[PDB]
């Protein structure tokens, strides 16, 4: 593929995040786990338990095969359901709750976000972290004002002007080479997210852009760099990576 560097970067960034907030023996709840793309990362992190939840059953089964056919020291649990707009009660709490490239889907409606934020807080141990990587609304609107909304790797389209300005847009179309196709993405209303979480005991402890986060980490972990094979992305690839940001809330 022609997006390998972009996959390496994203996985790199995610691995570093996991390394930063997880510790040995931790219990992790992976929301929007997908096809278990982080099982290996967690295996290196030496975590003890892994629970993955995804709305799509086609991905869960893929995450099962992977878990089933891999050298892992942690117990896995998969469940296919809606963890954002449908009540969720798994029974136990977790030290770390991860939602990689998937939490923005919780912003479907006002109620959805609320349910989703409630589902996160009730499955998080006090002191526990909720790490995520979501698209940056600020970034996107700027590329919009610059007219540069795409390239050979991706494409984004906002909604129509009928009685609406930029700040009034709630969603957009995202297309990615060898990935989603005109997938409907919901903008992450940051302020509403913060307030909503703060109301449930979760505080904002980290918000950084993918590129900076990437550059900063790539310098502190040169080994994980060459290990995951990476270094110096083309500006064309940077645009795709630059769309996402890192956000972390902790249950004080
Ligand atoms: N979905 C996935 N990615 C990313 O693409 C990779 C696919 O490879 P993969 O899942 O096969 O990873 P491994 O080889 O197992 O990694 P491993 O070698 O175990 O480390 C994932 O791992 C995600 O990083 C996405 N990136 C963006 N921007 N947007 C998306 O919607 C998206
Ligand atoms: N309400 C919901 N509950 C759980 N997963 C959801 C969801 N809405 C969307 N998703 C999931 O969001 C995921 C986004 S992509 C998942 C990628 C994965 N975290 C990685 O790092 O590769 C998809 O697998 C999709 O099925």
Curated annotation (Swiss-Prot):
Changing residue 66 to A/Q: Reduces activity by over 98%. The record marks 35, 41, 66, 104, 185, 244 as: mRNA cap binding. It is found in: Nucleus. The keyword Transferase applies. Pfam families: mRNA_G-N7_MeTrfase. MRNA binds at residues 10-11. S-adenosyl-L-methionine binds at residues 14, 32, 54, 82, 100, 105. GO terms for cellular component: nucleus. mRNA-capping methyltransferase that methylates the N7 position of the added guanosine to the 5'-cap structure of mRNAs. Binds RNA containing 5'-terminal GpppC. This is mRNA cap guanine-N(7) methyltransferase. It comes from Encephalitozoon cuniculi (strain GB-M1) (Microsporidian parasite). The gene is ABD1.
